[PDB]
Amino acid sequence: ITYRREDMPFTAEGIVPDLIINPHAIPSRMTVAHLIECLLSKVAALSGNEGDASPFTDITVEGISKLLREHGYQSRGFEVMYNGHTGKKLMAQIFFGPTYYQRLRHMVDDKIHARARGPGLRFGEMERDCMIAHGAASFLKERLMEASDAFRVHICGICGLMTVIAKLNHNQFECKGCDNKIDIYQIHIPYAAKLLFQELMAMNITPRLYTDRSRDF
Amino acid sequence: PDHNQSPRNTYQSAMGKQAMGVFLTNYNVRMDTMANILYYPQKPLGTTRAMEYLKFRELPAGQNAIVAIACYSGYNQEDSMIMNQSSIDRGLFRSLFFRSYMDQEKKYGMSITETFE
Amino acid sequence: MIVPVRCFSCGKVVGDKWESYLNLLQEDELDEGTALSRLGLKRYCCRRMILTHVDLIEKFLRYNP
Amino acid sequence: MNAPDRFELFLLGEGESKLKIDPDTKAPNAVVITFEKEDHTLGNLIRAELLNDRKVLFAAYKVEHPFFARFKLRIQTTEGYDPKDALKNACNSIINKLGALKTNFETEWNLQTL
Amino acid sequence: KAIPKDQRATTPYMTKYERARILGTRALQISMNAPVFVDLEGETDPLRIAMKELAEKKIPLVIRRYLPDGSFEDWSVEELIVDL
Amino acid sequence: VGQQYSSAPLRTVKEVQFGLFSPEEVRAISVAKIRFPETMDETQTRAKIGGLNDPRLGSIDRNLKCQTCQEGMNECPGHFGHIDLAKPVFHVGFIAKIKKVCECVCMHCGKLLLDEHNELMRQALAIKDSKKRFAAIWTLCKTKMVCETDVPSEDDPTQLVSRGGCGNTQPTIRKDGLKLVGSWKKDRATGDADEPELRVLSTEEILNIFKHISVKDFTSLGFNEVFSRPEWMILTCLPVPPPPVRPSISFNESQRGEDDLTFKLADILKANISLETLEHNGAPHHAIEEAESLLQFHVATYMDNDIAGQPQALQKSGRPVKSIRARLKGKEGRIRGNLMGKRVDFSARTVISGDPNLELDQVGVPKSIAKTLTYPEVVTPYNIDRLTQLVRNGPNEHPGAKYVIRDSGDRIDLRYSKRAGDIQLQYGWKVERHIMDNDPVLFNRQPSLHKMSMMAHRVKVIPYSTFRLNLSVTSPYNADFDGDEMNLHVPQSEETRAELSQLCAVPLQIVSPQSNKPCMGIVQDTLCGIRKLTLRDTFIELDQVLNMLYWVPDWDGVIPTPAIIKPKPLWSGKQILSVAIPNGIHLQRFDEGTTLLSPKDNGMLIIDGQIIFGVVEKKTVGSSNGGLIHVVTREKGPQVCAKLFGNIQKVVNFWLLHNGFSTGIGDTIADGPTMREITETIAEAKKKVLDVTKEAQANLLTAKHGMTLRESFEDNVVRFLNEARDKAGRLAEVNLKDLNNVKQMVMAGSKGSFINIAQMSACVGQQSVEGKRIAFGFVDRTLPHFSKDDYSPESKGFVENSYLRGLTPQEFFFHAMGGREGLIDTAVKTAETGYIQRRLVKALEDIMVHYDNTTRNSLGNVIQFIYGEDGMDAAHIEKQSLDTIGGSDAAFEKRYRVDLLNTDHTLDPSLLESGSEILGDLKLQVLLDEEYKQLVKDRKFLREVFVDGEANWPLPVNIRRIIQNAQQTFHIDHTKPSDLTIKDIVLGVKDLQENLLVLRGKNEIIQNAQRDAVTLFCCLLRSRLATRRVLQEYRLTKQAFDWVLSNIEAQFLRSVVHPGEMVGVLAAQSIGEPATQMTLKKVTSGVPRLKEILNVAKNMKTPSLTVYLEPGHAADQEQAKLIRSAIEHTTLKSVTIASEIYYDPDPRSTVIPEDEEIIQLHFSLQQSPWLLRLELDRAAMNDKDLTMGQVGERIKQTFKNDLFVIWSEDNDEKLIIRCRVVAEEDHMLKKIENTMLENITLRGVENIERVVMMKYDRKVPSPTGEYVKEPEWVLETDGVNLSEVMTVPGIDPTRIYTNSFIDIMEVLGIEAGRAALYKEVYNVIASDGSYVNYRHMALLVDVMTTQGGLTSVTRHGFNRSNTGALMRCSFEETVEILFEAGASAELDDCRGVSENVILGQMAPIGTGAFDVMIDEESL
Ligand SMILES: [Mn+2]
Ligand SMILES: [Mn+2]
Ligand SMILES: [Zn+2]
Ligand SMILES: [Zn+2]
Ligand SMILES: [Zn+2]
Ligand SMILES: [Zn+2]
């Protein structure tokens, strides 16, 4: 979030931070440099002298501390600060200082891509396995269902084949080979499954779509 | 870098590569696919010595933020930051961004030209 | 590029103090620490402004068009 | 692009009032008021004035989200004391305190040389 | 394959998935203006009405629980204890 | 769909039966016969010919006419054609299989060449995997080339037994594209039988041989008597797909049109016809053969475009081609392209940012993203105005809509529409509004390894870009805000809405199945803040109380009466936090030194929603087990808990904002002196290390048994330097003040462990690569800045300095080395874990808990007879204390013995109302005796199970709490006697147990199962509602008690796993997710091990035995040794100093002095002159407890007489085995010398190389009852031989364990295998402290074990692991997968998520695992 200068917590000096980071980012990274640069960067700003933060110099948190202290700030970087909303002091003191920040690319506006379509960012196998775990089958249905028309076929109740000749007006259903007229079902499947099955039949392969779970077993 | 956890140096070494600075001074004169130029590139208040030979104080990539390590409104948790909006207004971290696009005319087509019109 | 007009943090008009600082430096052979305090920039928030600044423009005005 | 125009912070867009007055249900003689396009500037002020007033049992304010310019104000006043009147009263109480300061200042400002 | 109203071994309690799906199915009805069974003591939102119908044991649906062998128990949403 | 009617029932495909079209059926179902290889223009009269594109098949020309099935191009499901093949033809797909079957059956009688008579064949036949059997049979039968006439029976090889009386030799069949070529021989090179005869096995031969294969023979192959006969693999009769499969692009009128399959078929028909017009006309043989192989080619190419070429001559002289395989290359790959989640619709992705002001279950959607994603909302009197308001607002004003969709399915595009502001919304239209505040959306963060990382939130449209998450919903998603994008997905239908908000809704996810705990806690600021706010020293001035108060929206407006009213009205920090907490919430926990006065403000007590004492931090308010979130969730509902996060956050955050929390370098500095102690602590280890150096350079360090000097010197140094870093690290953690911001985070729980403080403040500590100090990369020195052979800490990579102090360049580079090791295999752990988790899922994907509480896979196999052995849902289990198990028998009696007939051990007439008249009531004391003998069995039973003595076991229903609620809900006073009867308790509880029902079957087996599933919960229950307990401790009245019973029963039922639970996926992602956190004594642990285990790798990296000594001798350090030696494989090599071959020709006098005495000594109460003389080493000689005699008579019993052996005796200063052969001698000896040094086993079990003893502290019950640690020696071995080691005298063969769960299986059976496999998988998950509720691993370990063997997870199949032919279409060849499914009659259960997606159906998973129907009952 960006606060305006009003709300920021301010220092006695009327200085206020351009940037508030969180202390919980600190112990677990072991990112002490950030602190010592910050300590230094402060002295530096105060003193005009460019702050040598080179590795393997004889420079020291203790030395940089002494210099800041000479500049009339508390030497460990902290600064009493006043909550901007109320003006009241902050009960705790806030490690305050310049620190070189880089602004990195790949900015928000470049990654807001919101491809909602009526007529990362995916739903891959892993998110599928997630929705399964959830129990959420109809969501899984809605989300994986292709735009492919829910085309309606008819089937024989013996050989789950799509060999049912349907005179729908006349209410007449004949499955040749099986001698079926009464034991016949109608099921909706994506037309691209209908096709795939016919393509499968075309290649001498019976994909039998049944309607009961347990077999003749 | 000798005060950092070892891997943290590695990470930085990467992100520095995605810092916005002033890649070249002649940038206004190059047409390069992406360009990110910082309004107010400042030298780091904390320079390195090796920094000299790197021309960093010359073409710096970043600015000196007045940074507070604070739990503030609660809005800077888990690696967010509360940025000072006013600072932003006065120019802090603004950047030019030059996307330059390129397009040509026809390959071999027997009077199958492409016309910029 | 050129001097920010105002110190980011607080908004001291800082961009009226750049040549004078360059003077406080060259013609009056002063050091930046002393010089910046003379321009009035007393809080490090405004100091880092001038002292950190890189005047790349004087390199941009070196190309022809 | 998503960024709401900055004026929306101190300027009322349409249909919004300055004050919405709601009768707190949870307690007797209490009210919740929503200031639109104000913030702590006013909130913390009015509250700590509202709080001085002794026939006020409860004063609190909160801005529920940093994004929006508005805040809610709850005042619980004694039986037979109207919170609107407590507001009015704590409002006046401020206007008068600032008059003083405005004066005192312009006064002590003139005595200064520079 | 069907199992008689007596000898139902399945939970007398509605399963979180069943509720999820009644409420779903029921709301999908309420949403297309199919008629509601309870008093809409304010509600405009389908699911919230569907839940009110379940609450007041007024959903007119039967859940068919299939056992892994293929046989099944029928329960009436009315019968099913909603305690989740 | 197709607004017409059909009387036919509307159903859903429940099963797909795959098979092969018998030629019979291919005709039977077909409508045409198809003769003419052309279409249209019948002498120019346009339409169609009775040959193609019409004879009965689907119509074109907009014509409804279509065998009277009418309808037209959109409503007709194209009917199938027929085409007789002049000759039998190999169906391309099965050429492979055909050949293969032909290798298994005799090529003359059609008789399986190997019967039930051959023994290697009954093992082949018994295999149930139709595919694996066929392979096992084939690898057995392809050796055969003679269809045996008489086979050695099950008796004498003298005695032959008859079989298929056809003696003919088989060809070895090789392939040549489409022709199978067979070559015979009357044996390999025997006289008068040489030279094979290559003849092409024609289709006509094979088809007839296939027909002769018996229903029995081919069924013992993959083949199905009914669905897929071998013969059917051979095409006689070809299905003709109609015009919807093969279209005709007739550009309006008067232009040609017929697809690239139509032409490809037209050429088959041509070849077919010209093959007929060569039999009907008569012809030469290599003319019909040529005409056959042309046909066979065209049938082949018709289906598979990957043979001896590509026939691309179909209406184009430029030559492109399309087959039906290459049609599925755009239809197995356009279904798979949509099976991989590409066309991501109604979803949106952006940076996430945290936001402490959203509720826990909100997701801040930027307005602009809100304006993009729609929800189709049906216009409804309830919503007509709002919808109308939106439609007016339009695509650009927020609470607006993009599209108004009218009855007719038209889409008014409110953006570009001349009527944008002029639409009368009618009921039943869809408006596609924007998502608005409170829409359930499904918010997910990839990689999403975790039901908890796809949760549903209420939308809250907000200003700027970026999704906004409540901070506490953070780790369920493993999300931070340093750039993470998240996907938001808008459920589109109303039931799809309902499902989200009813199952995946974030509140419903607080207590997660994965570790039977909450998985969302209070975090970062809110945690840190809450601790601070909670300290006793934290007090709140009225002025700020009112805000904090007002901040909690659920506040009731009562200002709490301040805990200090004296000089200043002053509230406790606790008091106001206690208003975030709702009423009825209690919590007792005790830390190390908590009392009811808890000095250190330790522990935790909350009563009726006022935290009475304890600092609130991670323990309480975090995600931890017992914590306040667990409690509030179970006790008060998920939603009311979810709202709690809000309150707590809001209050605490508000508090923190005006208090402030930071951290500086000052926080990371040690007390001047501490630094000297630290510097001393380190410099105190560099002596230790230095002393061990000097020690070892002297050669005074004794190598620890089975460990080299150099190996054990490092080991010491590393531990010194760690003991150092650590005692160093403690030295700074104790220092740092309770002000210390770093420590202030550490106390509270938010980011920050000891190692962190430790490395920043005290020593950084020893770096290490491949678990060793830094290695000599340069020759004998780690950098060119040290001298050669420098083994000091500084050299070998101890970083002495804190990070605060800065690191030396060496330290910096060594740290960099260790660092690079970290990132390198942080990349390995990410990459391997990434894929394990995807295998673990695929493995368990289909396991579900069905309505019978059974847990089954897609096939229907019982994996668990009750889910996780107790039928409980893991999200309804809490760790609970089984008290019956613990403490002295003495104590057991004190708590639980109620003996009325004893003025001493009776219930005192104060506890009980009828307390006095109870004294001496025989009849009662017979009930209370029943109770207690039962409690006694219980304690005994429990100690049999938890041999460990572990009291605390995840069980459902927190009984402690319910009681604690009773005692508060009834204001029970621990002062007046309770109005309970003993009969009330004793019978009440007895009666309660009969009510805890996981299972409901009325039969005995189930009632027995039910009794077991409830056993453990019941002992808890019995031990909790024991008569004394109920009165002594609890003081329950009849009212509260009767309440506790009905509550325990209530929650118990609430705790039972719901049929529907994709419990497997759950179990896989419960094992996976945490492994996606394993980022790291010498045994392979973590992901290498996990990838080792799941892989069921027989070749383990670190095979170990762990043997325990027989009970009576555990302490005997000398018997541990005596076993160690008698186990550790001890070769001659290991005990011989040197070997020498002398020429020493006289077997009496000898050219070796030190042996004159030994030949003399072997002449008191043939041979070569070449002598093999071994000089043995006492050191290792007596160390391995070995005799010269023993070494000797070993070699003498290894080389029969073929070696003359003689050895010095055990007194002689030099130990010597002298050996001669008994002339090519010097060479047979160097062989024998080697056969000795390598092969001969002096002592031990082979493969057991190191055998280390170790003291293991063991929990064992003492005589008085309580659990006492009893140290035991335990041999741990490099090398596994569990069979031979098990049997060694003096070990506890009962307990001997190996990590090689594979050898365990092989020696102890599968059930023990599983037991061990579970202990391994769990060790992996325990080694990173992590917990995963038992049932998850059980289910993994059960699935690995269901089929009698250890079946690996990390894919075993190239196809499947448990996947239907339809499901996620794997390989660029699904055709191949389907072909086999045809041939093997793959029976698809359609319990898949993909099969059913393919079918346009929801899965029978969870919410789709039952059907809904319309009740005719409801009045
Ligand atoms: Mn993180
Ligand atoms: Mn991240
Ligand atoms: Zn049929
Ligand atoms: Zn400034
Ligand atoms: Zn038709
Ligand atoms: Zn034969």
Q: Which residues of F touch D61 (CB under 8 A)?
A: 547, 550
State the CATH number of the domain containing residue E31: 3.90.940.10
| F79 known ligand binder | yes
Residue of A nearest to E69 (CA): A214
Q: Which ligand is nearest to the CA of F481?
A: 2
Ligand nearest to the CA of A164: 3
- Whether F476 and D16 have beta carbons less than 8 Å apart is answered as no
d(CA F710, CA F769): 17
**Tokens 């040509």 -> residue:** B104
Token pair listed for F1207:
């050895």
Query: How many Å from the N-terminal Cα to the C-terminal Cα in chain E?
Result: 29
Enclosing H/E stretch for F218? helix F215-219
- Which residue(s) pair with D75 in the sheet? D31, D59
Kindly report the nearest CA distance between residue A115 and chain C, in angstroms.
38
Active site residue B79: yes
Helix (H) or strand (E) holding B99: strand B95-99
Residue F86 in tokens = 């002049």
**Residue of chain A minimizing CA distance to F18:** A207
CA dihedral D76, D77, D81, D85 (to 10 degrees): -70
Burial class (CB in 10 A: 0-12, 13-18, 19+), F1416: exposed
The parent domain of residue D103 ranges over 1-114
Q: Do residues F1105 and F1253 make contact, with C-beta atoms less than 8 angstroms apart?
A: no
| Best residue of F386, F1058, F1402, F1405 to probe chain E, by most E CBs closer than 10 Å | F1058
Tokens of F125: 């036949």
Test A86 with D40 for CB contact under 8 angstroms: yes
**Residue F261: closest CA among A204, A208, A203, A205:** A203
Name the nearest CA neighbour of A83 among F543, D47, B73.
B73
Q: Do chains D and C touch (3 or more CB pairs under 8 A)?
A: no
Spatial CB neighbours of F850, under 8 Å, sequence gap ≥ 6: E66, E67, E68, F856, F1059, F1409
- Number of the ligand closest to the Cα of F147: 6
Sign of the alpha-carbon torsion through F653, F655, F656, F658: positive
> Quick one: DSSP state of residue F704?
P
Closest in D44, D66, D67 to A86, CB measured: D44
A interface test, pick of B59, B67, B80 with most A CB neighbours within 10 Å:
B67
* B38, β-bridge pairs: B95
Residue F1039 and residue F966 in contact, taking contact as beta carbons nearer than 8 Å: no
Do F and B make contact via 3 or more CB pairs under 8 A? The reply is yes
Q: Which residue pairs from F302-307 have beta carbons closer than 8 angstroms and sit at least 24 positions apart in sequence?
A: F302/F261, F302/F264, F302/F265, F302/F268, F303/A203, F303/A204, F303/F91, F303/F92, F303/F93, F304/F92, F304/F93, F304/F1375, F307/F92, F307/F177, F307/F178
Burial F762-788 (b: 16+ CB within 10 A, else e): bbbbbbbbeeebbebeeeebbbeebee
Could you give all domains of chain F from N- to C-terminal order, each with its CATH number?
Answer: 15-90+237-345+1365-1411 (no CATH), 91-236 (no CATH), 346-372+436-509 (2.40.40.20), 373-435 (3.30.1490.180), 510-662 (1.10.274.100), 663-808 (1.10.132.30), 809-870+1059-1129+1245-1364 (no CATH), 871-1058 (no CATH), 1130-1244 (3.30.1360.140)
Option in B36, B47, B83 nearest A2 (CB)? B83
Smallest Cβ–Cβ distance between D1 and the set A3, A7, A109 belongs to A109
Helix (H, G, I), strand (E, B) or coil at F275: helix
Ligand positioned closest to the Cα atom of F106: 6
Closest CA to F884 of F1018, F1019, F976: F1019
Q: How many domains does chain D have?
A: 1
Q: Name the domain count of chain C.
A: 1
Q: List, as residue ranges, the binding site of B for Mg(2+).
A: 79
Cβ of F18 within 8 Å of Cβ of A206? The answer is yes
List the one residue out of E20, F503, F1413, F36 whose CA is nearest residue A134. Answer: F503
What residues of F are in contact with residue E46 (Cβ under 8 Å)?
Answer: 380, 382, 494
Cα separation, F623 vs F1357, whole angstroms: 40
- Cβ distance A135 to E20 less than 8 Å, yes or no, reads yes
Interatomic CA distance for residues A69 and A63, integer angstroms = 10
Question: How is E22-40 classified by DSSP, letter by letter?
Answer: HHHHHHHHHHTTPPPSS--
Q: How far is the CA of F485 from the centre of ligand 2 (A)?
A: 9
Work out the minimum CA distance from D52 to partner chain F, whole angstroms.
10
In Å, the largest CA–CA distance within chain C is 39
At F577, list the tokens.
């936090």
Token pair for F885: 């198990």
How were these coordinates obtained?
X-ray
Task: Check which CATH number belongs to the domain holding D34 and give it.
Answer: 3.30.1360.10
CA dist F1164 → F1159, F1160, F1197, F1210, F1217 (Å): 10, 8, 22, 17, 18
In DSSP notation, F303-367 reads: H-S-SS-----SS-SS-----SHHHHTTTTSSSSTTTTT-S--SEEEEEEEE-TTS-TTEEEEEH
Q: Is some CB atom of chain B closer than 8 A to the CB atom of C30?
A: no
Q: What six digits make up the tokens of F595?
A: 């009392």
Closest CA to F1388 of F504, F498, F227: F227
DSSP 8-state code for residue F1144: -
Question: Contact, F1073 vs F449, CB < 8 A?
Answer: yes
Contact C45 A48 (CB under 8 A): no
Closest CA to F1102 of F1279, F1325, F1274, F1249: F1279
Alpha-carbon distance of F13 to A188, in angstroms, equals 9
How many Å apart are CA F14 and CA F16, to the nearest integer?
7
CB atoms within 10 A of CB F690: 15
Query: What is the C-alpha radius of gyration for chain A, rounded to an integer number of angstroms?
Result: 36
Check A17 against B67: CB less than 8 A apart. Answer: yes
Inter-chain touch B87–C9, beta carbons under 8 Å: yes
Listed by number, the residues of chain C in 1-60 with a beta carbon closer than 8 Å to a beta carbon of chain A are 8-11, 31-36, 43-45, 47-48, 51-52
Show the tokens assigned to F1263: 């005589």
Q: What is the distance in A from the centroid of ligand 5 to the CA of F51?
A: 17
- Which subunits sit against F, judged by 3+ Cβ pairs under 8 A? A, B, D, E
Report the sign of the C-alpha dihedral through residues F1277, F1283, F1285, F1290, in that order.
positive
CATH number at residue C20: 1.10.10.60
From D103, A89, B3, select the one nearest F801 (Cα to Cα): B3
* Best C14, C46, C51, C54 residue to mutate vs chain B (most B CBs within 10 Å): C54
Catalytic residue among B2, B79, B89, B103: B79
Please choose, from the candidates F89, F59, F63, the residue with its C-alpha nearest in 3D space to the C-alpha of residue F77: F59
Whether the CB-CB separation of F476 and F444 falls below 8 Å is answered with no
Contact call for F and E: 3+ CB–CB distances under 8 Å: yes
Q: How far apart are CA F359 and CA F71, in angstroms?
A: 55
Pick from C8, C53, C54: which is nearest to B58 by CB? Answer: C54
Four-residue CA torsion sign, D29, D30, D35, D41: positive
β F539-541/F1272-1278 pair status: unpaired
Q: Give B73's contacts in chain F (Cβ within 8 Å).
A: 356, 653, 657
Q: Determine which of C12, C31, C37, C45 to mutate to test the interface with A (most A C-beta atoms within 10 Å).
A: C45
Residue type, F1323: N
Q: How far is CA F1363 from CA B112, F451, F1296, F1366, F1382, in A?
A: 53, 21, 39, 8, 15
SS3 F1278: strand
Judging by DSSP bridges, how do beta strands F1272-1278 and F1255-1256 pair with one another? antiparallel
Give the CATH H-level superfamily of domain A120-204.
RNA polymerase alpha subunit dimerisation domain (3.90.1800.10)
**In the block, residue with structure tokens 């108004």:** F404
Q: CA–CA separation, C3 vs C5, rounded Å?
A: 6
Amino acid in position F83: I
**Chains touching A, CB cut-off 8 Å, 3+ pairs:** B, C, D, E, F
Residues F901, F924: Cα–Cα separation, whole Å: 10
Domain count, chain E: 1
Chains C and F touch (3+ CB pairs under 8 A): no
E neighbours by CB contacts (3+ pairs under 8 Å):
A, F
